[PDB]
Every structure is written in structure tokens, then in C-alpha cells.
Coordinates of N, CA and C in Angstrom, one line a residue:
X1 N 1.9 10.3 1.7 CA 3.3 9.8 2.0 C 3.5 9.9 3.5
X2 N 4.6 9.2 4.0 CA 5.0 9.2 5.4 C 6.5 9.2 5.5
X3 N 7.0 9.8 6.5 CA 8.4 9.9 6.8 C 9.2 10.7 5.6
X4 N 8.9 12.0 5.6 CA 9.7 12.9 4.7 C 10.6 13.7 5.6
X5 N 11.9 13.7 5.4 CA 12.8 14.3 6.3 C 13.9 15.0 5.5
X6 N 14.1 16.3 5.9 CA 15.1 17.1 5.2 C 15.9 18.0 6.2
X7 N 17.2 18.1 5.9 CA 18.0 19.1 6.7 C 18.7 19.9 5.7
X8 N 18.5 21.2 5.7 CA 19.2 22.1 4.7 C 20.0 23.2 5.5
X9 N 21.2 23.5 5.0 CA 22.0 24.5 5.6 C 22.9 25.1 4.5

């Protein structure tokens, strides 16, 4: 895969 992006808060 390519371009896996996560923001968690």
C-alpha cells in the first residue's frame, strides 16, 4: 500500500 495517513487525539 501507499499513502496511509491517520491523526488520532
